[PDB]
């Protein structure tokens, strides 16, 4: 079906991201936890479209720091850990279904699956260094934390909770743990090049692409926004 091939219109972060996208080497599908967008049918659309368009497809699920999102919203730690595991198992099941249907390898990971990967750890250490040492970079990281907390609360019916600094700093551990895949996902995984794909703009990525930080995306790493249009 060519309806499936055209299921999404692609908006690249940069012209470099567009070239990586048009190379079609690899797409990494970012599945956010505690986000109403990622229903079973949406995850199916993502993988159906990706399987018809890219040579290699990988799905990225949230790792352990996803519990920090729930904690910052009040959830006690063991209930939060339990709900993360249920959320991740749900994402995995829906992702596995669609990949199996497309005759694709079940290439699904969490961002916590790479603690013995040198690329992940070195990029993570760079992210932490500049979070601590560059207030400009820290401010952008905390804004990403705000976005993740706002989206979680709305999807869990908690827009009545004010978002404080200590909430932001607790949740930003989620942001820092996922960012190495924004910056170097292809090199972490072992592909020549890759685009991380998501449905919302990445404003910190726009600043990185404007040369505003010592933090850089890898030359073989891009970011694309997927939109659906009639
Ligand atoms: C599991 C990490 C999700 C990545 C998405 O782009 C949202 O951060």
Residue numbers in the entry: 2 to 231
Copy out sentences from the published article reporting this entry, exactly as the authors wrote them.
Cyclodipeptide synthases (CDPS) are a family of tRNA dependant enzymes that synthesise cyclic dipeptides using two aminoacylated tRNA (aa-tRNA) as substrates. Here, we investigated a CDPS from Bacillus thermoamylovorans (BtCDPS), a cLL-synthesising enzyme that utilises Leu-tRNALeu as a substrate, and is predicted to be part of the biosynthetic machinery involved in pulcherrimin biosynthesis. The aminoacyl moiety of tRNA is transferred onto the conserved active site serine residue (S33 in BtCDPS), forming an aminoacyl-enzyme intermediate. This intermediate then reacts with a second aa-tRNA to form a dipeptidyl-enzyme intermediate, which undergoes intramolecular cyclisation aided by a conserved tyrosine residue to form a cyclic dipeptide.
The DBE moiety sits in the P2 pocket and the nitro-groups H-bonds with S33, Y199, S152 and interestingly to R153, which we speculated would interact with the AMP 5′-phosphate group of aa-tRNA substrates. To validate the docking experiment and test the importance of R153 to reactivity and active site architecture, we produced the mutant R153A (BtCDPSR153A). Structurally BtCDPSR153A is extremely similar to the WT BtCDPS and BtCDPSS33C. However, activity with both Leu-tRNALeu and Leu-DBE is completely lost, supporting our observation that this residue likely has an important role during catalysis. Besides the loss of enzyme-substrate interactions, the structure of BtCDPSR153A highlights R153 importance in correctly positioning the active site S33 sidechain (ESI†). The conformation of S33 sidechain is rotated by ∼85°, which orientates it to an inward facing position, closer to the sidechain of Y199 (another catalytic residue) to form an alternative H-bond in the structure of BtCDPSR153A when compared to WT BtCDPS (2.8 Å vs. 3.5 Å). Additionally, helix-7 is displaced (<2 Å) in the BtCDPSR153A, due to the absence of R153.
